[PDB]
Design an enzyme around this catalytic site. Structure first.
Site, PDB file in Angstrom:
ATOM      1  N   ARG C  66      35.326  14.625 -32.147  1.00 13.51           N
ATOM      2  CA  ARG C  66      35.021  14.736 -30.729  1.00 13.51           C
ATOM      3  C   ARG C  66      35.862  15.843 -30.095  1.00 13.51           C
ATOM      4  NH1 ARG C  66      35.172   8.699 -29.979  1.00 13.51           N
ATOM      5  NH2 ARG C  66      37.047   9.098 -28.716  1.00 13.51           N
ATOM      6  N   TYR C  70      34.307  18.570 -27.436  1.00 10.71           N
ATOM      7  CA  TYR C  70      34.876  18.832 -26.122  1.00 10.71           C
ATOM      8  C   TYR C  70      35.194  20.319 -25.980  1.00 10.71           C
ATOM      9  CZ  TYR C  70      35.262  13.731 -25.937  1.00 10.71           C
ATOM     10  OH  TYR C  70      34.978  12.384 -25.944  1.00 10.71           O
ATOM     11  N   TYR C  92      29.083  12.223 -14.945  1.00  9.97           N
ATOM     12  CA  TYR C  92      28.863  10.902 -14.380  1.00  9.97           C
ATOM     13  C   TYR C  92      30.211  10.286 -14.015  1.00  9.97           C
ATOM     14  CZ  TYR C  92      30.258   8.260 -18.585  1.00  9.97           C
ATOM     15  OH  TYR C  92      30.960   7.692 -19.618  1.00  9.97           O
ATOM     16  N   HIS C  94      33.620   9.661 -12.027  1.00  8.89           N
ATOM     17  CA  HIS C  94      34.625  10.593 -11.544  1.00  8.89           C
ATOM     18  C   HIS C  94      34.875  11.621 -12.645  1.00  8.89           C
ATOM     19  CE1 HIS C  94      38.448  12.250 -10.302  1.00  8.89           C
ATOM     20  NE2 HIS C  94      38.613  11.413  -9.296  1.00  8.89           N
ATOM     21  N   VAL C  97      38.347  11.220 -14.628  1.00  4.26           N
ATOM     22  CA  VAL C  97      38.817   9.895 -15.013  1.00  4.26           C
ATOM     23  C   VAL C  97      38.344   9.592 -16.433  1.00  4.26           C
ATOM     24  CG1 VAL C  97      38.624   7.411 -14.534  1.00  4.26           C
ATOM     25  CG2 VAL C  97      38.967   9.009 -12.644  1.00  4.26           C
ATOM     26  N   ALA C 124      33.871   4.062 -12.912  1.00  6.17           N
ATOM     27  CA  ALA C 124      33.522   2.727 -13.369  1.00  6.17           C
ATOM     28  C   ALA C 124      34.536   1.714 -12.842  1.00  6.17           C
ATOM     29  CB  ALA C 124      33.451   2.702 -14.877  1.00  6.17           C
ATOM     30  N   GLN C 166      36.891   2.075 -23.081  1.00  8.40           N
ATOM     31  CA  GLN C 166      36.378   2.472 -24.382  1.00  8.40           C
ATOM     32  C   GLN C 166      36.717   1.399 -25.415  1.00  8.40           C
ATOM     33  OE1 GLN C 166      37.790   6.462 -25.211  1.00  8.40           O
ATOM     34  NE2 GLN C 166      36.616   7.333 -23.516  1.00  8.40           N
ATOM     35  N   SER C 234      30.996  -0.108 -22.196  1.00 10.56           N
ATOM     36  CA  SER C 234      31.654  -1.377 -21.915  1.00 10.56           C
ATOM     37  C   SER C 234      33.116  -1.149 -21.537  1.00 10.56           C
ATOM     38  CB  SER C 234      31.552  -2.325 -23.087  1.00 10.56           C
ATOM     39  OG  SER C 234      30.202  -2.667 -23.362  1.00 10.56           O
ATOM     40  N   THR C 235      33.577  -1.890 -20.526  1.00 13.46           N
ATOM     41  CA  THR C 235      34.986  -1.956 -20.180  1.00 13.46           C
ATOM     42  C   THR C 235      35.443  -3.412 -20.267  1.00 13.46           C
ATOM     43  OG1 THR C 235      35.009   0.048 -18.830  1.00 13.46           O
ATOM     44  CG2 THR C 235      36.653  -1.611 -18.296  1.00 13.46           C
TER      45      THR C 235
HETATM   46  N1  LIG Z   1      28.575   1.810 -16.588  1.00 14.39           N
HETATM   47  C1  LIG Z   1      29.822   1.550 -16.970  1.00 14.39           C
HETATM   48  N2  LIG Z   1      30.317   0.304 -16.774  1.00 14.39           N
HETATM   49  C2  LIG Z   1      31.573   0.048 -17.161  1.00 14.39           C
HETATM   50  N3  LIG Z   1      32.458   0.857 -17.736  1.00 14.39           N
HETATM   51  C3  LIG Z   1      31.940   2.083 -17.919  1.00 14.39           C
HETATM   52  C4  LIG Z   1      30.667   2.498 -17.578  1.00 14.39           C
HETATM   53  N4  LIG Z   1      30.483   3.830 -17.920  1.00 14.39           N
HETATM   54  C5  LIG Z   1      31.623   4.188 -18.454  1.00 14.39           C
HETATM   55  N5  LIG Z   1      32.556   3.180 -18.474  1.00 14.39           N
HETATM   56  C6  LIG Z   1      33.903   3.241 -19.029  1.00 14.39           C
HETATM   57  O1  LIG Z   1      34.266   4.595 -19.194  1.00 14.39           O
HETATM   58  C7  LIG Z   1      34.464   4.875 -20.598  1.00 14.39           C
HETATM   59  C8  LIG Z   1      34.024   6.285 -20.903  1.00 14.39           C
HETATM   60  S1  LIG Z   1      35.152   7.510 -20.202  1.00 14.39           S
HETATM   61  C9  LIG Z   1      34.223   8.120 -18.765  1.00 14.39           C
HETATM   62  C10 LIG Z   1      34.556   7.401 -17.467  1.00 14.39           C
HETATM   63  C11 LIG Z   1      33.934   8.060 -16.229  1.00 14.39           C
HETATM   64  N6  LIG Z   1      34.483   9.427 -16.021  1.00 14.39           N
HETATM   65  C12 LIG Z   1      34.219   7.205 -14.987  1.00 14.39           C
HETATM   66  O2  LIG Z   1      34.619   7.804 -13.964  1.00 14.39           O
HETATM   67  O3  LIG Z   1      34.028   5.977 -15.085  1.00 14.39           O
HETATM   68  C13 LIG Z   1      33.688   3.777 -21.313  1.00 14.39           C
HETATM   69  O4  LIG Z   1      34.151   3.600 -22.644  1.00 14.39           O
HETATM   70  C14 LIG Z   1      34.003   2.586 -20.405  1.00 14.39           C
HETATM   71  O5  LIG Z   1      35.285   2.046 -20.642  1.00 14.39           O
END
Ligand SMILES: Nc1ncnc2c1ncn2[C@@H]1O[C@H](CSCC[C@H](N)C(=O)O)[C@@H](O)[C@H]1O
Ligand SMILES: Nc1ncnc2c1ncn2[C@@H]1O[C@H](CSCC[C@H](N)C(=O)O)[C@@H](O)[C@H]1O
Ligand SMILES: [Zn+2]
Lengths: 60, 262, 262, 56
Positions: C66, C70, C92, C94, C97, C124, C166, C234-235
């Site tokens: 990865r 990137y 998508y 922030h 973040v 998220a 993640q 998933s979080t």
């Molecule tokens: N729809 C969603 N619901 C819950 N957690 C989410 C999500 N999409 C992304 N995530 C979280 O974000 C991680 C990817 S990193 C990207 C995060 C994104 N920049 C933000 O601002 O949320 C995932 O492994 C998960 O932990």
């Protein structure tokens, strides 16, 4: 005048980019006074406004 | 009646979500708590039927517990909902981040059988990551209310970025004052010194509220915090004091090592 | 040339800020990384000149670090900026973040003498507070990337709300797989068990990406985590295992007691 | 589908209308019975028939 300008600048990415290129020119063109301009350039927010924002506590 | 709590972000006009703006526009009534008069004028143009929650704060040097202020705010909101109004609560930043009024109103509304929900917004924390170019995932992140950190037992991970919110009222136990004292801040300095050297560089951060305004990003040693100039909107960022160490116990269980890390 | 990185939030169309949408509209070119084809169509109608960053991910069961994905992403963005285009990166949530691409692009752009900034978005984390009706300030908040928590020494505060991001790739060290295995999750359970009982209720959270979609909010005992169905989005939320207790040490220095608290 | 979802996500009036009566609103925007079924059952993959940017 001042309020109308700030509201537009905050929302409009075209004007924002124009502003970033030439702050004084854009500000003067939107009718801002020299005093107002000076305040912006010196970052004196108090003069531009010429309230509490705490909505929680830590006492449980 | 119904309730929707939305956030307007920190920056004037531009930092609110598209849908959240739509909610304000179509509302029967709006209860607001915004940063300044520029934001207040902006809101009134979107929807003229606005009640300013600011009025519920102590007036004329009166002594008033903020818990009572918040209760009165919630009651005002619910009265509108009970009357049958399609009610929107517009708070600055994110309506549910270090803000009890929205959560409380939604809880009470549901209990009385009303539709109530909260729409996420852009918080001061969200602004901080962008302005300082810091990814909270880099070494992790922790947030605490400054006073709670003092009054209760919290242990920070000195490898992560630590944020102390409401630093300006750190140690103000009465909930009737609008700021704390330098002696209180000195106690916090000594407490933090369990993990952070006195010469550890910290950052006082203030996100801008106006598009012509630069954010405050003042770097100083932790030792000097008690003399610093703080405002209610100030947030204290404490960068890591230690780098990440390997967790050999877990690495071994995973049957890998640092050199196998991708 | 110039660069602005924006977030689109999690929800389709509605969760982007007013100003950020404006940036996309007026851009010369847009590099996108969006959740689904509905968002992709939305973006294209806003601005037709779009390059999809998704293409730089491993294709056809290929093995690809990865880190290389990137890097290729960052280079593609910078190629537009260097060419002289007014470039917008639309990610998508922030954009800064748990996302390294924007920070990296901005750093590199500034180094080559280009204007580059990042606009905050709704993450998220912000969606979670709203959907679960939890205030991060209630008892504090900590966020860690799941694998980092495993690989390195992090110490959580069990009075806070703890987020592991993640979680679906927790322990995946090669950075070449799209998901982990149950045995890895079991090792995480044993690790967490230092602070949290096996029967401690945790929450698997997934914010909705479509307006007709409900969020995933699955509660289960920590022990059952390794059998759970996890997705890349998933979080894992781990609520407090302990209630707040008074810090008599600091209270004493403040010359006050619990009864003096407002 | 796409046009409907984009409108619904942006427009707070339509959103409140939707929440009042999802099926009525979906039918009014021409969604098929199978599309409506997918929504009501929460089968997102079927709707797409009709994301990691960091490491630790
Ligand atoms: N729809 C969603 N619901 C819950 N957690 C989410 C999500 N999409 C992304 N995530 C979280 O974000 C991680 C990817 S990193 C990207 C995060 C994104 N920049 C933000 O601002 O949320 C995932 O492994 C998960 O932990
Ligand atoms: N402009 C600003 N810059 C930095 N921190 C700010 C800020 N405005 C508020 N804060 C932080 O938030 C605290 C008030 S609690 C309200 C926070 C708001 N709901 C949000 O989403 O940000 C302040 O004491 C400070 O710690
Ligand atoms: Zn956070």
């Amino acid at each position: 005048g001042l309020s109308d300008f700030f509201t537009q600048l905050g929302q409009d990415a075209q004007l924002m980019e124009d502003y970033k290129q030439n702050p004084e020119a854009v500000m003067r063109a939107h009718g801002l006074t020299d005093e107002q301009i000076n305040a912006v350039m010196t970052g004196d927010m108090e003069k531009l406004k010429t309230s509490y924002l705490v909505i929680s506590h830590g006492n449980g | 009646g119904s309730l929707v709590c939305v956030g307007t972000g920190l920056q004037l006009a531009g930092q609110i979500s598209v849908l959240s703006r739509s909610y304000i526009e179509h509302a029967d009534i709006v209860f607001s708590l915004l940063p300044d008069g520029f934001s207040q004028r902006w809101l009134t143009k979107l929807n003229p039927n606005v009640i300013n929650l600011q009025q519920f704060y102590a007036q004329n040097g009166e002594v008033k517990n903020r818990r009572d202020t918040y209760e009165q705010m919630v009651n005002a909101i619910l009265d509108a909902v009970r009357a049958g109004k399609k009610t929107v609560c517009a708070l600055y930043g994110h309506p549910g981040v270090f803000a009890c009024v929205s959560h409380m109103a939604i809880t009470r509304a549901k209990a009385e059988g009303f539709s109530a929900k909260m729409e996420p917004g852009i918080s001061a924390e969200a602004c901080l990551w962008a302005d300082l170019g810091i990814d909270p995932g880099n070494s992790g992140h922790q947030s605490f209310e400054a006073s709670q950190f003092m009054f209760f037992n919290h242990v920070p991970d000195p490898t992560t970025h630590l944020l102390l919110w409401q630093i300006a009222i750190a140690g103000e136990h009465t909930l009737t004052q609008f700021h704390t004292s330098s002696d209180r801040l000195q106690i916090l300095v000594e407490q933090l010194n369990q993990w952070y050297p006195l010469d550890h560089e910290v950052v006082i951060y203030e996100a801008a509220n106006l598009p012509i305004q630069a954010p405050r990003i003042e770097r100083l040693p932790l030792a000097n915090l008690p003399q610093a100039h703080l405002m209610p909107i100030s947030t204290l960022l404490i960068p890591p004091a230690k780098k990440l160490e390997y967790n050999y116990a877990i690495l071994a269980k995973l049957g890998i090592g640092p050199e196998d890390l991708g």
